[PDB]
Amino acid sequence: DAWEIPRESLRLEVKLGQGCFGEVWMGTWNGTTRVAIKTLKPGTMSEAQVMKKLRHEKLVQLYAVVSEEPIYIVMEYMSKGCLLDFLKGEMGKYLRLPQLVDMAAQIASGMAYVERMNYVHRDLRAANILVGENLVCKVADFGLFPIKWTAPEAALYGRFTIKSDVWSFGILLTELTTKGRVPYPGMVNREVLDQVERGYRMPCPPECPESLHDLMCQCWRKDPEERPTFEYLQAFLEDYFTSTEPQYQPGENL
Ligand SMILES: */C=C\C(=O)Nc1cccc(Oc2nc(Nc3cc(C)[nH]n3)cc(N3CCN(C)CC3)n2)c1
């Protein structure tokens, strides 16, 4: 493969995190290109062909690999990290509804491409979205309980579809509109399981327009196939402030 690279071409400069499966680093590639490098611990496992052939402006791009152990994965670099941390921290404070809805439109657009390609994400949530400069957001972490973000069919009967991802997108919309709070505040996993089965849904977060909550509630319909597509979600969010909320005026937090 042309994607396979020499081990000397990667400088691992800054350790970013460490999870169960390995590490993540900001680095350089061929001395010129900024990159993110994920490291698989040897023993953990032994798909990037898929990821080579998943190209979209709003999906973190695979750039290069090292396929014999120890494995290194080279990727597009998203400077600001986690969408969840970005929402909670010093940048949360200034984001208003137009920035957040535009962000949601990006992630919709990445998820619309995943939809066209007949793939399933399975863990769509603010923790698995990466942010770059100028509030660019991209879907990441396709190849790996978050029951609060997981549709009932999926959590209960392992029925994971693009429509279970739509459900998670409604949940993500609440994360954006609350600056990253955990959904169902004060509820534990079983409390949530039990309540959403009985018809309970998160209410309109403070300052969030009702037209948006409405969209969230379409995403949380009992029947997977009654939920909208990502092509619909994207288009609605893109056109939001002309077609749906033309009289939006700034508030204290949204
Ligand atoms: C929400 C939890 C979470 O994801 N935290 C987190 C902890 C440690 C490391 C990371 O990865 C990480 N990645 C990037 N950029 C990246 C990864 C890939 C793949 N492509 N691009 C950036 C960052 N950060 C940079 C910004 N700082 C302020 C914090 C970490 N972290 C995620």
Dihedral, 90, 93, 96, 102 alpha carbons, nearest 10? 20
Q: Go through the chain and tell me how many residues it has.
A: 254
Contacts of residue 111, defined as CB under 8 A and 6 or more positions apart, other chains included, come to: 121, 124, 139, 165, 169, 230, 233, 234
Expressed in angstroms and rounded, the spacing between residue 50 Cα and the centre of ligand 1 is: 22
Q: How many angstroms separate the CA atoms of 93 and 82, rounded?
A: 16
User: Comparing C-alpha atoms, which of 65, 78, 62, 68 is closest to residue 26?
Assistant: 78
Q: Does a cis peptide bond (omega within 30 degrees of 0) precede residue 6?
A: no
Residue that has been written with the tokens 């071409």 in this structure: 9
Please enumerate in sequence order all residues whose Cβ is within 8 A of that of 8, keeping only pairs 6 or more positions apart, or say none: none
Breaks (C-N over 2.5 A) in the chain follow: 46, 144
What helix, strand, coil percent values describe the chain, rounded to 5?
A: 40, 15, 40
Angle between helix 97-116 and helix 230-238 axes, rounded to 10 deg: 150
Cβ atoms < 10 Å from Cβ of 149: 26
**Cβ distance 217 to 201 under 8 Å?**
yes
In angstroms, rounded to a whole number, what is the distance separating the alpha carbons of residues 156 and 121? 17
The phi, psi pair for 40, rounded to 5°, reads -100, 125
3-state secondary structure 125-169: CHHHEEECHHHCEEECCCCCCCHHHCCHHHHHHCCCCHHHHHHHH
Angle (deg, nearest 10), helices 97-116 and 162-177: 170
Centroid of ligand 1 to alpha carbon of 130 (angstroms): 7
Evaluate: CB of 139 within 6 angstroms of ligand 1: no
Catalytic residues: 123
**153 marked among binding-site residues:** no
Residue 62 beta carbon below 6 angstroms from any ligand 1 atom: no
The reply to whether ligand 1 has any atom less than 6 angstroms from the CB of 81 is yes
Bridging pattern class, strands 33-40 and 72-75: antiparallel
Q: Is 84's C-beta closer than 6 angstroms to any atom of ligand 1?
A: yes
d(CA 204, CA 93): 20
> Ligand 1: which of 24, 51, 83 to mutate, most ligand atoms within 8 Å of CB?
24
CATH of 78-247, one of 1.10.10.60, 3.30.470.20, 1.10.510.10, 3.40.50.2000: 1.10.510.10
Q: What does residue 248 show for φ and ψ, rounded to 5 degrees?
A: -55, 125
* Contact in structure between 25 and 16 (CB atoms under 8 Å): yes
Solved using: X-ray
**Which neighbouring-strand residues pair with 130?**
82, 138
DSSP codes, 30-48:
TTTEEEEEEEEPTTS---H
Contacts of 180 (CB under 8 A, 6+ apart): 83, 84, 85, 87, 88, 92, 126
> Could you tell me if 118 and 65 are in contact, meaning their C-beta atoms sit under 8 angstroms apart?
no
Q: Domain boundaries in the chain?
A: 1-77, 78-247
Give how far Cα 248 sits from Cα of 38, 119, 240, 241, Å. Answer: 42, 35, 10, 7
Terminal Cα distance for the chain, rounded? 48
**Distances from the Cα of 159 to the Cαs of 121, 122, 162, 217, in angstroms?**
13, 10, 10, 20
Tell me, which fold does domain 1-77 have in CATH? Phosphorylase Kinase; domain 1 (3.30.200)
